[PDB]
Amino acid sequence: PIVQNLQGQMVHQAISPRTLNAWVKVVEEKAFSPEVIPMFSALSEGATPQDLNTMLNTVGGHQAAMQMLKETINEEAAEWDRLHPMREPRGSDIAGTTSTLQEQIGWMTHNPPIPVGEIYKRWIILGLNKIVRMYSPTSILDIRQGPKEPFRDYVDRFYKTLRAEQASQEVKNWMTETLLVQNANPDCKTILKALGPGATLEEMMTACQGVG
Amino acid sequence: PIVQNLQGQMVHQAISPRTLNAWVKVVEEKAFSPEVIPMFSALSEGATPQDLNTMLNTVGGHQAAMQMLKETINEEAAEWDRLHPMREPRGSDIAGTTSTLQEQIGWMTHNPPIPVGEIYKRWIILGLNKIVRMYSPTSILDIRQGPKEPFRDYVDRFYKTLRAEQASQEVKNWMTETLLVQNANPDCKTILKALGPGATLEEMMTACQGVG
Amino acid sequence: PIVQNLQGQMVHQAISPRTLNAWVKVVEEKAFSPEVIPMFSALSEGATPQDLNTMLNTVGGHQAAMQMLKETINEEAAEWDRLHPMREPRGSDIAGTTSTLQEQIGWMTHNPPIPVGEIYKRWIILGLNKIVRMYSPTSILDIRQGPKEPFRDYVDRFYKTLRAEQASQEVKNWMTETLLVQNANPDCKTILKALGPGATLEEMMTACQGVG
Amino acid sequence: HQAISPRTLNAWVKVVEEKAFSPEVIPMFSALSEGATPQDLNTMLNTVGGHQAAMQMLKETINEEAAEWDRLHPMREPRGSDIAGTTSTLQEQIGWMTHNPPIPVGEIYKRWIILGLNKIVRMYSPTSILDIRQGPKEPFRDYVDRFYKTLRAEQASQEVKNWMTETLLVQNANPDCKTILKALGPGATLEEMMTACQG
Amino acid sequence: HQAISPRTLNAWVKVVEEKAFSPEVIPMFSALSEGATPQDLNTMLNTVGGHQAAMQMLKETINEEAAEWDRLHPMREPRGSDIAGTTSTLQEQIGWMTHNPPIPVGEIYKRWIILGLNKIVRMYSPTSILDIRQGPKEPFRDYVDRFYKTLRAEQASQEVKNWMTETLLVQNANPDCKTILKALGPGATLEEMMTACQG
């Protein structure tokens, strides 16, 4: 990150070792669940591109994931260079491989600031979303409430898979409205259909509390 | 949060990356148990509205929960604007979407301080209470001691569900006084009725120690 | 690590007690999984050779692991002294046993910096790679998808073992391309062969989602 | 104004009775009712003999749409009941379509009827698209035909329909066909899908 | 603008229903849709009940042809979707037809539909031409009629079609007709083959 000096100069504060260790734990233990994206967003708050590259050096242990992460970063950099044909930050400068750290500080501290950090964070989040989409164990259509599974657990699994699949907004709305009811077990599906169309998730959860 | 400079000026200290990661872990892993409210209160100590919005960007992954969190925030903001018809902080300013950070510092550092942070924290806690009330797996009437469940575990589950359901104070007192005894298994229910009315929880727990 | 003083002098900041405790937890609890190398890389960011020796004092509890870690460090130091026949840092100085801390600061703060810390980190990572290669439970050829194991879990186990075995790059590419398909169960192996040669891991994972 | 042809009326009644309510009824109605006035539309609806429950639902939906029109809009301007043709006369209905700028009362009523018929078709479909699934020995061509008929009777949005087309067709097939479809993999076209799945 | 006749619409639906997708449906469509606009062609396709697999394939081929037209050609000009009528409107279609020189969106869409229907017929050929074998007692008349119906359905290239007519016709005949055809020899026209093979 970037922190004011005692005299006010913005000097780069290196990302702490335990923050990197936490990111490593998320990458290794979590097996690219849908929750690695909120955790990445939390850990990389205010991180510069050099810090983001330091973090991706930990996910570099995985071959395919790092490969398509860098390919998505390259695609986004090409898009930026198309939109954007000290020096102005180029697409490769945002990646923190051709630019130097002092240039990163100058870009992040400008008036208004040049959000190179947030741009690179968004690109990396797109790559992580693709990786998460690969690693999901089951598609949304596979999820179905068990004979005795409570509706809370089934809804949690359904929304986890929905976050994993990353469908469009309208498709997601239709899925949450209809496919959730369709996949529910018959005992709860009866109450879900009794509630009728337009049933908010609050009503669906309260009505099915303890049915299983 | 807000921290004094070396020269004494109150400069905003950004919420640490690991604090945000801890909040993300609470949101994702805990599945909105009743304990996410104490954990939110601990993590957001002294947080400004911008920090609270940064934290809610992590719970934004959930659709319905974030939706009714923002709707409860809007209701509370409307209530504030009804009560309240640099500039005085408006309801939307408390939400940290129309106000700027420097205005937040000015409001929090006033003499006496304008507790915008605590007000927004209370609103967010109301929203989280509603979300927790949805996600409870069973109602209070469902809880019942098992054939061999120790009374300590049964009381812990009962009080967890009681925190989840968030009934009124008088209703909560009646429930803890009577419904706890009623739902207990017969072997412990005999001792509970033998103790008679007005039995404090200490006496009930000590009398039933090791009965199961 | 090394941190600027209030007056700008680079004074050594001792590695925090909790960072050492985290490294101890990684060494003891993880049983030298393949993930101890990313975790070591994260924890030892910017660490000087004295800090690295302090960290290896924790892995010194294990006899054989510490023995071959120090033997690999000695081999790399001999290689450095062959390449390299205040004073210039010698191979033993990089190990942080003959050099003093102030010399380490002088070497790390030079223009351009003398990356003694990163060199020693690379040597220690080579030693840890050897130790991990010993402690792997099964060879790559042993891994095989179960009758009902999802392809995601099987791929995760396969890539964990691949990281453990540390084969050459071409051998690793051939293994991931062919041995992964060969070891898969017949139901998924049919789809893997149907995809044909040159199937990227993304296509293989998406095609086999939910087959088990 | 020209009266609706008796041949056209007989064709409309015949297709309604024969098809009961299949998804083709909506384009058939749109084709037959080209430029028709509300009087002619009411004639076409009233002339239907059977399926009087469905005709009652169509009347109810027309009433709801008329109420919504009256809510939004509280010769003379036409109200909802005027658009429905219950109150408007034939001369009045010739009016409102020649003012230029007009208010196409006939097309506005046709829209309400089309919405009602979409509801009727969606209910009359035998099963939902998610419930549609290939049999153990069903031919894949027949299963595709049933699936796309149900999808036509679905009433979902266009993006949702595209997602259904891409995913559910592969997902719902029996394992013998599903293995072949998975081997073909994503991005394949329906022609390749059945030519591979011909067996 | 002239709306399409209910008689013509019902004739198209009836011929599709009764002939399934025999090769004559392509010329029947070309005849009935003469001068039709994109809206009229969309009605013509949508009104077809059953064979929704084939209608889906026609829609997919329409989308592919629209995409190719868009790459070839990247009031507003017509896109492929506009030509297909999904995005454009009847007023814009009439304007494109009326422009000097005109942009024949109707003929382009008809060509796309004809390509789709050709693919449909090629698939819906019930049996491959290699399996058309004369029975022990079947007339050569019925045998060659079946053979040429299948050959029209297959829609193979000219050279392979000529080879088929030269070789498979005599190869697949029953022994009684096979001997006569072999004695007659190669380099023969169909009228010669049939008039020699009578009885």
Numbering used by the authors:
A (entry chain C), B (entry chain C), C (entry chain C): 1 to 85, 96 to 222
D (entry chain D), E (entry chain A): 12 to 85, 96 to 220
Question: What's the publication's text?
Answer:
The mature HIV-1 capsid is composed of the capsid (CA) protein arranged in a conical lattice of hexamers and pentamers. CA assembles into a conical lattice formed by roughly 200 CA hexamers and exactly twelve CA pentamers, the latter of which facilitate lattice curvature and closure around the viral genome. Monomeric CA consists of two folded domains connected by a flexible linker: The N-terminal domain (NTD) faces the outer surface of the capsid, where it stabilizes the hexamer, while the C-terminal domain (CTD) forms dimeric interactions that link hexamers together. Here, we present cryoelectron microscopy structures of continuous regions of the capsid lattice containing both hexamers and pentamers.
Purified wild-type HIV-1 CA assembles efficiently into CLPs at pH 6.2 in the presence of the essential assembly cofactor IP6, which is coordinated within the CA hexamer pore by residues R18 and K25 in α-helix 1. These CLPs have a predominantly conical morphology resembling that of authentic HIV-1 capsids. We next sought to generate higher-resolution structures of the CLP pentamer using SPA cryo-EM. We focused our analysis on regions of the lattice containing pentamers and determined the structure of the pentamer surrounded by five hexamers (the “global” pentamer structure) to an estimated resolution of 3.6 Å. In accordance with our cryo-ET data, strong densities were present at known R18 and K25 IP6 binding sites in the hexamer and at the same sites in the pentamer, confirming molecular dynamics predictions of pentamer IP6 binding. Importantly, these SPA hexamer and pentamer structures are indistinguishable from those determined via cryo-ET and via an independent SPA study described in the accompanying manuscript, demonstrating that SPA is suitable for structural studies of complex CA lattices containing both hexamers and pentamers. As in isolated authentic capsids, pentamers in our CLPs were quite scarce, present at a pentamer to hexamer ratio of ~1:20. The structure of the pentamer within the capsid/CLP lattice differs significantly from published crystal structures of cross-linked pentamers and instead matches the structure of the pentamer within the virion. This indicates that a combination of capsid protein (CA) and IP6 is sufficient to reconstitute the viral pentamer structure—no other virus-specific factor is required.
